[PDB]
Amino acid sequence: ALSGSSGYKFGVLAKIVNYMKTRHQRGDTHPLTLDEILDETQHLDIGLKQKQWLMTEALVNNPKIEVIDGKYAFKPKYNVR
Structure with missing residues (x-):
């Protein structure tokens, strides 16, 4: 939806x-x-539903993310080589 594409x-x-x-x-x-x-992305407000979604779905199944010690890191594609 257009109202969704916005962000x-x-x-x-x-x-x-x-x-x-x-x-x-x-x-x-x-x-x-x-x-x-959130701070650096300017999404501190975000919304409990959104933060929750990121915590259990996005930053959990996203191939470019690596869960480490509860925190979330960035998973490299194949290394810049």
């Missing part, structure tokens, strides 16, 4: 994946807690 879930997740990637690309490949990610 009702996908936009938020896309910005998170992008941020995590770029950060992991720079050097900070280390894991980050949920809230730590």
Whole structure:
């Protein structure tokens, strides 16, 4: 839906994946807690439903994410080689 394409879930997740990637690309490949990610992505408000979704679905089944010590890291595709 148009009202969904804006960023009702996908936009938020896309910005998170992008941020995590770029950060992991720079050097900070280390894991980050949920809230730590929200801050930089500017999604601290987000919504309990959205945060929950990210915590159990997105940052759990997304191939570009790696769950470590409860926190969430970025999973490299195949290494830049």
